[PDB]
Symmetry: C4
Subunit: 33 residues, 4 copies
């Protein structure tokens, strides 16, 4: 359960990095536009 | 109270997947 | 601590709704563009 | 292990605030 809570925390963090990156790419694409 | 936390975690993850869908639509709108 | 964990969960959820909404507005603005 | 969870929660919140900053920049780029 705690191990499960832990995996989910990390999964949440990983998606968050993915999201940041996606918005960062958008931002860049628009800034050079 | 661990399960209730794990439960919230699940919900939060689902929001993130919904966000990723919004981003996919957006990126297509922007021609990327 | 558990009450603190709880407030943070909810705060996280609230920002997530805000974010969804912001992306939803963007999407709409671009779709009508 | 509660604090370690609370700790992760803090980190996650900070990412969300960074995201909100990226969104502010984006919305200005789009003239909104």
């Amino acid at each position: 359960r705690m191990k499960q809570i832990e995996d989910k925390l990390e999964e949440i963090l990983s998606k968050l990095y993915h999201i940041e990156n996606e918005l960062a790419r958008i931002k860049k694409l628009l800034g050079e536009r």
